[PDB]
Amino acid sequence: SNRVTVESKDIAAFSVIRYPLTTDKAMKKIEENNTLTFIVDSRANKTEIKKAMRKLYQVKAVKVNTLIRPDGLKKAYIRLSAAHDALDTANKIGL
Amino acid sequence: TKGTTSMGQRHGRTHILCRRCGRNSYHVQWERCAACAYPRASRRRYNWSVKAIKRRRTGTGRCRYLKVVNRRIANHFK
Amino acid sequence: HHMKIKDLREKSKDDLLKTLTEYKKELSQLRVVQQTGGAETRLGRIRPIRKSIARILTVLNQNERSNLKMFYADRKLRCKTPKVLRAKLTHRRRLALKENEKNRKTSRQMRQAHKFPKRVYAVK
Amino acid sequence: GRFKPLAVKKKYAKKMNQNKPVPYWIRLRTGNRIKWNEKRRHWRRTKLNY
Amino acid sequence: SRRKARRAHFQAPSHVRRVLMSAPLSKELRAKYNVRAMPVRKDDEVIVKRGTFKGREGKVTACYRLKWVILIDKVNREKANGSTVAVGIHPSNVEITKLKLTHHRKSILERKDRSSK
RNA sequence: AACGUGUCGCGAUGGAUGACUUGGCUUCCUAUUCGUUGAAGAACGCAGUAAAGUGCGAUAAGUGGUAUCAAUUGCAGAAAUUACCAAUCUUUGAACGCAAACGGCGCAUGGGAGAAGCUUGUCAUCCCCGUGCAUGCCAUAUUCUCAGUGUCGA
RNA sequence: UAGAUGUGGCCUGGAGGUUAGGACGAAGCUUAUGGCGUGAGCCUAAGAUGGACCGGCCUCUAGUGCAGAUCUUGGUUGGCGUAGCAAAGAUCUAACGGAGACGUUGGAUACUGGAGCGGGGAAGGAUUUCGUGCCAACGGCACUCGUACACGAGUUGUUCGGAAACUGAGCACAACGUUAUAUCGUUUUGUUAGGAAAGUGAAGGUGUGGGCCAUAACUGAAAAGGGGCAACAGAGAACCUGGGUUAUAUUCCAAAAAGAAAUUGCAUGUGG
RNA sequence: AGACCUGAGUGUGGCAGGACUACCCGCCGAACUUAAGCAUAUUACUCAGCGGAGGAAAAGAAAACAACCGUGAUUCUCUCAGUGAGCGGCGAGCGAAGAGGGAACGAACUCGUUGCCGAAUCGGGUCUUACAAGGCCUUGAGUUGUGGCACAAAUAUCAU
Ligand SMILES: [Mg+2]
Ligand SMILES: [Mg+2]
Ligand SMILES: [Mg+2]
Ligand SMILES: [Mg+2]
Ligand SMILES: [Mg+2]
Ligand SMILES: [Mg+2]
Ligand SMILES: [Mg+2]
Ligand SMILES: [Mg+2]
Ligand SMILES: [Mg+2]
Ligand SMILES: [Mg+2]
Ligand SMILES: [Mg+2]
Ligand SMILES: [Mg+2]
Ligand SMILES: [Mg+2]
Ligand SMILES: [Mg+2]
Ligand SMILES: [Mg+2]
Ligand SMILES: [Mg+2]
Ligand SMILES: [Mg+2]
Ligand SMILES: [Mg+2]
Ligand SMILES: [Mg+2]
Ligand SMILES: [Mg+2]
Ligand SMILES: [Mg+2]
Ligand SMILES: [Mg+2]
Ligand SMILES: [Mg+2]
Ligand SMILES: [Mg+2]
Ligand SMILES: [Mg+2]
Ligand SMILES: [Mg+2]
Ligand SMILES: [Mg+2]
Ligand SMILES: [Mg+2]
Ligand SMILES: [Mg+2]
Ligand SMILES: [Mg+2]
């Protein structure tokens, strides 16, 4: 190996999903749709935002739409499988 | 003519961003940085512009490993 | 409050990695709070809770660098250790000449150090 | 217009953030020398081209 | 030199800025411990020896140690809107009358006193 | 007269001058000179509130060690700040898997997610993480493989 | 006049000496403040100036005296409220807002006239978008408005564009050559004095009643012409409507997917 | 049907490139200017250009100077010396060296040859407290010579 530095299961899932988003549009999409809005790290992956959700918020994710905002910050919309209410996570996650 | 009118024909880009020099002197067509000669291993450096050498020497940037290694070699270690 | 390192060294890797994943989650939701409300009491725990993840990844790296050093710094055969653990010292201090030479001499150069040594004479 | 590399996108985003004013908790600091931002770009005045 | 001293002064780190802010002990607290002067600590009762607030005793509220001043609890000043604020007397204009204990202060106080004795 | 002068007092603009000077310059001196173990450079980042800068690198305005004592300070917050001397050290760059206005693409190699099938778990592509993989040169391989109508011999 | 020379001669910055001032007000600065020196200049006074340094003398020292260089820099000024703000669409009204020519809505008359003051893109710009404020200076008039300022937001893709994955004009890493030297030259109408590569097929290894059957290892089957870029208009490319954003939509919609397709990968299984 | 020779291939173990360049070393290298013109010359064996190291570099232990009553590695300094040297359209200009006083300096050494040896060498192991100035196994390099020793028709070499 060319390293010693320790790794875990945590840092692989807490670096991707960094904090949720609260806006007029990020709120209008939790209630109306079942999406959430997390400002994911920029070099993440739509398949790894799903894994991260399920590893952090034990909910399923169907469609994870992303976009690198004009701030270098990668937003992420996340449908919650229609079986996990989104309005029951923003109230859990404390959004 | 050759003034305000011809200034309208200014569509292209001769230079884009140099991945090594970080400035806007990467000549597109023949792909070489006009200011650091990238992809040439050696950065361009000419004594006929010492003033531009000074803008590009060490210490003009962050100088990470040296501000550390110059501390270790000045304290009997290496 | 947070993790105190003087009592954190004694912990183990598997005990640290559960200690770690809990400071991550605690900071994970402190950056939820930091979005919506200000709540300096609910907030303000970030800079201690974010430097406690620092002094856990520290001791994690402080340890598994030693375990991988009390395993490679060995008299084992063909003792080639990864260059990240090999005593780091400048590129030229690494090439120049170790102590075992730069003091090494031939025959017919040892033997004058004996026949004709340098003396500690004094003049009167 | 619509094509910008991501790297060229990362560099205008680093400029949209640098174009905010000095917050009014800075000028009550003990001995600062800052009253204005004096590096604020305006998109019309001066261009970045990167 | 002139130039290097006014730089090592104003460019002095925080732990240096505390021995450059030491105040003389009172006439009857020095021979109590047989030393000359101490760096001012938060909650050490003092008395101003110079200035508009001279001869005004108080307890050091803080050592605002980049303004180069200490804040006395009874030395206040009024703003325009009634709100009362604290003026900073340079420690050398102050004379300590009280100390705050420590197993690191009545140990260094006799490190300074072992110089005398 | 009004205007235009013109001298005086007072104002405005202006920012000289003086006073100051944590800067410059010059001179001298005491020691030790970066990088494939990834430098210099630049790129993007990181603060409870930070745009620049300074500091730092996803341990991010710092973690560790010692050694010091009670602050930091715009104001929150909090039973640390300062100084020094083992780590962490992102994307690049000599940049070296290939490329490159692609935050792109592989080849090995582990391990770790996630799952459909399937046997409560097990590795399918998919997707992360990490190492290795550039050329040249030197050394070398218990008899590691080879080429030659070069030499010779069984 | 050019020039020369003298001056116990004038002046500025600083040094070595000396004498001496200064918060009971130093430098500086102002002048119908006088006086006194032929003069350079000095000294005084008086400042409803200034706030902390400094004068005389003897030597020393120099970045030492300015009106004039189309001097240099900064600032001001005249002309001067002057030239002008004259090409390109004529605003008119109500009542409403507003601190108030301004805006909004209605009505009116128009202008652009489908090679547009239209709707979309590339190049380029990169927040100018949006909303809510705001109105200091910027929009050469003005503004309650703004592409301005502030805050907040805003860009959603199996299928669209790009890449992964084509070749063109061409480029040139390697090698090789040359060069004191390379950052030089050759280089797809196929490289190189030139040994430039796992795509396949296999015996053997492996669960187990020595073979039924199966993955795998590590070999190694012929096979010439090293790689590699270069096209957001060439080639290529699996998605279409309907609709519920302050600003995105062939991107979003969740289960009477608003629907309907196509399609790639791997899988289980009905058809032989 | 094998050795050797000459070449390959990847496996290991490494290294090189890059930065810095004030000084330093090599190559390259002008012109403006001066000569009241200018082409020799001067500028200048300079600037720029290519390359390369160091804490200094370079030089350095006489195929040296001298012509003396001789000196004795290199470097540096004062000096010789702007030279009664000298080069030069003998013009403009240029221009050293020995010696001397110094600094420094316990400053000298080792290959090849020669003779005597001839694998005593080197490298991979291993064993020992890491001992590799050693032990003891090693064809693995090496006999196309690693290593050891001696310094002159004058010394003493050479072994217990
Ligand atoms: Mg091109
Ligand atoms: Mg290259
Ligand atoms: Mg170079
Ligand atoms: Mg001034
Ligand atoms: Mg160096
Ligand atoms: Mg790095
Ligand atoms: Mg920075
Ligand atoms: Mg390369
Ligand atoms: Mg080797
Ligand atoms: Mg063989
Ligand atoms: Mg043969
Ligand atoms: Mg002067
Ligand atoms: Mg002058
Ligand atoms: Mg003047
Ligand atoms: Mg004039
Ligand atoms: Mg704006
Ligand atoms: Mg080339
Ligand atoms: Mg040969
Ligand atoms: Mg061979
Ligand atoms: Mg290798
Ligand atoms: Mg190279
Ligand atoms: Mg080099
Ligand atoms: Mg001439
Ligand atoms: Mg010459
Ligand atoms: Mg040069
Ligand atoms: Mg040398
Ligand atoms: Mg002379
Ligand atoms: Mg000459
Ligand atoms: Mg001599
Ligand atoms: Mg020999």
Side-chain angles (χ1 to χ4, degrees), chain A residues 2-8 12-30 33-59 61-70 72-84 86-87 89-90 94, chain B residues 2-76, chain C residues 2 4-5 8-9 11-12 16-74 76 79-97 100-101 103-123, chain D residues 1-34 36-50, chain E residues 1-27 29-43 46-48 51-56 58-73 75-77 79-99 103-110 112:
Chain A
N2 288 337
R3 77 190 230 203
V4 295
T5 300
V6 186
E7 63 89 21
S8 224
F14 290 91
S15 66
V16 286
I17 295 174
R18 296 189 293 105
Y19 58 88
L21 185 65
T22 281
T23 65
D24 291 333
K25 182 177 182 180
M27 292 297 293
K28 187 177 180 181
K29 291 179 73 67
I30 295 170
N33 300 319
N34 281 317
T35 61
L36 293 173
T37 56
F38 298 94
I39 294 176
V40 179
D41 61 353
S42 296
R43 359 234 339 192
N45 191 357
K46 281 164 66 174
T47 184
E48 294 294 326
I49 297 171
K50 291 171 70 173
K51 295 182 181 181
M53 291 294 290
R54 186 64 184 270
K55 184 68 182 297
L56 298 178
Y57 297 98
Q58 289 73 14
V59 300
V62 175
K63 186 184 288 293
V64 176
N65 297 320
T66 60
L67 66 162
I68 297 169
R69 300 194 296 113
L73 302 176
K74 187 174 181 181
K75 188 188 290 183
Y77 301 99
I78 298 168
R79 296 283 295 169
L80 298 179
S81 68
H84 299 285
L87 190 60
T89 302
Chain B
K2 60 189 179 184
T4 63
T5 300
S6 69
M7 303 302 292
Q9 284 76 242
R10 294 295 176 92
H11 303 289
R13 299 288 296 277
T14 289
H15 299 286
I16 57 173
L17 277 299
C18 190
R19 291 188 298 272
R20 186 172 74 192
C21 241
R23 67 183 298 166
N24 192 359
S25 66
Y26 189 74
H27 193 275
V28 177
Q29 293 182 5
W30 58 83
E31 294 85 3
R32 65 102 178 85
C33 196
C36 75
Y38 179 77
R40 190 176 75 191
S42 302
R43 293 181 182 265
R44 72 187 288 275
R45 181 184 181 276
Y46 296 104
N47 299 323
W48 48 257
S49 184
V50 178
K51 185 188 289 182
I53 295 171
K54 301 296 181 181
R55 296 184 188 98
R56 291 197 294 263
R57 296 176 67 252
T58 66
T60 61
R62 253 186 85 164
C63 189
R64 324 170 60 143
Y65 182 76
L66 269 65
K67 70 174 71 176
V68 175
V69 72
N70 295 323
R71 186 67 63 86
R72 243 289 234 253
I73 61 177
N75 289 318
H76 291 173
Chain C
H2 62 84
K4 280 72 179 176
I5 187 167
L8 185 62
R9 299 287 184 183
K11 284 170 84 285
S12 65
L16 287 173
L17 296 176
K18 291 302 294 178
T19 308
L20 182 63
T21 185
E22 223 182 37
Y23 290 106
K24 302 295 285 293
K25 290 183 174 66
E26 181 65 25
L27 179 59
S28 178
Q29 65 85 31
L30 287 172
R31 297 186 184 277
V32 179
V33 173
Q34 188 177 2
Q35 296 300 114
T36 63
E40 288 80 359
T41 179
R42 179 70 277 170
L43 190 71
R45 295 291 297 165
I46 297 171
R47 196 250 179 261
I49 207 71
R50 186 172 63 88
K51 302 295 186 296
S52 301
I53 303 169
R55 63 175 62 91
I56 293 171
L57 293 174
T58 303
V59 303
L60 284 167
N61 297 325
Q62 293 302 116
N63 291 321
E64 193 170 3
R65 176 177 287 270
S66 65
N67 288 323
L68 274 295
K69 188 180 290 292
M70 281 61 259
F71 186 80
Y72 287 151
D74 190 358
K76 69 179 180 66
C79 185
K80 298 288 97 178
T81 67
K83 299 175 185 178
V84 303
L85 288 172
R86 326 173 29 152
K88 186 174 180 64
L89 50 84
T90 65
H91 178 74
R92 63 177 298 165
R93 308 214 71 278
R94 189 182 303 119
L95 302 176
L97 285 180
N100 49 1
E101 65 268 11
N103 58 3
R104 188 147 160 175
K105 346 190 268 335
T106 61
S107 200
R108 213 274 253 67
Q109 217 26 298
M110 265 117 127
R111 292 186 291 110
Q112 285 69 8
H114 294 280
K115 217 111 66 212
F116 301 99
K118 306 299 289 186
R119 305 300 303 274
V120 188
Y121 63 94
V123 175
Chain D
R2 196 263 305 167
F3 169 68
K4 74 286 292 177
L6 179 59
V8 175
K9 185 177 182 180
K10 299 296 289 183
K11 292 180 94 291
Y12 288 114
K14 188 257 186 64
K15 296 286 99 176
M16 292 176 68
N17 293 318
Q18 292 183 355
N19 195 1
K20 291 180 173 65
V22 176
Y24 186 74
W25 61 268
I26 295 295
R27 294 188 297 274
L28 282 73
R29 294 175 65 185
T30 181
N32 64 3
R33 256 108 135 96
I34 295 168
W36 293 97
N37 191 359
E38 296 298 328
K39 287 176 90 290
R40 292 183 64 85
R41 187 185 69 255
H42 187 74
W43 63 273
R44 300 178 73 93
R45 281 131 218 188
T46 183
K47 303 296 188 292
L48 296 174
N49 292 319
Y50 56 77
Chain E
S1 65
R2 179 72 187 277
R3 181 179 175 180
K4 296 181 177 67
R6 288 180 58 87
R7 182 178 63 192
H9 180 271
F10 294 96
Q11 259 194 192
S14 179
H15 72 279
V16 176
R17 288 175 181 266
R18 68 177 293 275
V19 68
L20 277 66
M21 290 178 69
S22 65
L25 296 176
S26 65
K27 185 178 179 180
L29 183 62
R30 61 180 64 187
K32 177 66 174 64
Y33 298 106
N34 193 1
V35 300
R36 181 69 179 173
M38 283 293 172
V40 179
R41 181 182 174 89
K42 183 181 288 292
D43 289 331
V46 297
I47 186 168
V48 179
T52 62
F53 297 103
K54 66 184 290 183
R56 179 172 292 176
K59 191 73 177 293
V60 173
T61 301
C63 182
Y64 197 94
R65 192 168 66 241
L66 62 78
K67 296 291 183 180
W68 292 100
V69 298
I70 62 172
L71 296 174
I72 297 170
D73 184 1
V75 73
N76 63 5
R77 165 103 186 79
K79 290 176 70 68
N81 61 7
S83 178
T84 185
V85 297
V87 297
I89 301 89
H90 187 272
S92 65
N93 295 322
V94 174
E95 183 178 2
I96 293 172
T97 304
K98 179 71 175 178
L99 292 176
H103 63 87
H104 293 287
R105 290 183 65 88
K106 60 181 179 292
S107 66
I108 61 88
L109 178 59
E110 286 76 3
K112 295 180 183 179

